[PDB]
């Protein structure tokens, strides 16, 4: 999920 913010 981090990839969608980072």
């Amino acid at each position, epitope marked *: *999920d*981090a*990839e*969608f*913010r*980072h």
Partner: antibody
Amino acid sequence: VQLLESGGGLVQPGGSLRLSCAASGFTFSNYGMSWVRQAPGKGLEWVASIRSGGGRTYYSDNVKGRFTISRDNAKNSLYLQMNSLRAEDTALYYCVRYDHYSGSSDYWGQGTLVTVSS
Amino acid sequence: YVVMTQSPLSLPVTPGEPASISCKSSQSLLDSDGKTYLNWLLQKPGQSPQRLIYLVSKLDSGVPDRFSGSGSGTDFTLKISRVEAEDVGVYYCWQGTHFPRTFGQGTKVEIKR
């Protein structure tokens, strides 16, 4: 919100397969999406992600260079092109929506089963 | 890279009684933006996963408030105040702070009827 996967089946080791996921009930082009897989009787493993913007993508170490995630916003569809399949790729593949409003993946599809075998 | 460890892996519980599942990460899930991206889902028998909780303690749509989540940093807990038959299945925590996404091993809740 509905996510409906298809395309799973039996493939020879080293072969290729294309999975599709048809989305409805939301504005598809506004959401990031991912594929997550579950080997029979086992846990959950993230496979690949694609942003709502720019076709930016991300892959797990195990599938780098073999799988390609894409989307067709016109057709409300997410795809996974799987090449050079290995026995260890055998699993139920789920289409999963990322909810930017809650900061977390939310809806999962029903999954499509990929079996890699001779 | 961030390892999520759940305990216990099997959880038999008598209906009406509370249950608790631990989820510990190998490093802090506090993001630089101030938020803590720790989530819980449930996979009921024969069904696809469904989210129960996000941002540690926030209940998703339609989830009853007998479920609660707490914790900070590396140590998290899902509690069910009173377990019901419909709560049977496999519970997973996962983190959204660090790339790549990682899930716990899953805790299977059994109802002791």
